[PDB]
Structures are given as C-alpha cells and as structure tokens.
RNA sequence: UUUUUUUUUUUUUUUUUUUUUUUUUUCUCCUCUUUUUUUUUUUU
C-alpha cells in the first residue's frame, strides 16, 4: 500500500509505505493499526537536524 | 537567484405476532255540550 499524499492505493495492504507526517497522523488517533505492527523502519534518520521538519 | 512535505466521502442486516357493528339517562301530564247511537229499499 502507498499512502503518499497525491496517490492512495490499497490502504488495507499488509505493508504500508507512506511519508512521515502520515505516521504521526495515524499515531495521534488510534486507527487500530498499532495493534498489528511488528516492524517500523525509518529510511532517512538525518532529518532530526532538519530546521522545519525535524 | 525562491527548494521539500502535510491520508480520506459510518460499519451492519437473511425480524415473530392467534381480532370484529355499537358503547352511557331526563319526570308526572282536565280532549267542552241535540241524542238515543242511524240501519229495509233500489239504481255502481
């Protein structure tokens, strides 16, 4: 599944690939997806130093 | 000489029922005068 802002495909797939703001969007609410999460992996950790998105 | 990112129109449907017009009041109440009562009869 792809949860990018301008393309939404198969939002119920086993594996979801999304931008970072989507993760906090589904973490503010319950969304009943956290119960079945085994691995969550980050691809670019060097944005902790980002001046506007860190 | 001005880049990068910020999801979207609630889920559900394959439940049983053996009655019958109406419907419920109003009180006792001084009748004036020629009479017995005439009468057959025939022409429809």
Phi/psi for A24 (5° steps) reads -70, -30
Q: Residue A17, SS3? A: strand
Distance A39 CA to B33 C1' (A): 133
By what technique were these coordinates determined?
cryo-EM
**Is the separation of the CB atoms in A39 and A47 below 8 Å?**
no
- A47 CB and strand B closer than 7 A: no
- Nucleotide nearest A11, CA–C1', reads B7
Distance of alpha carbon A31 from alpha carbon A43, whole angstroms: 23
Among residues A47, A37, A30, A46, the alpha carbon closest in space to that of A16 is found at A37
- A23 CB and strand B closer than 7 A: no
């Amino acid at each position: 599944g792809l949860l990018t802002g301008d393309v939404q495909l198969h939002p119920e797939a086993s594996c979801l690939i999304m931008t970072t703001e989507i993760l906090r969007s589904m973490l503010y609410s319950g969304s009943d997806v956290i119960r079945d999460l085994e691995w969550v992996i980050f691809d670019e950790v060097h944005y902790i130093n980002d001046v506007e998105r860190g």
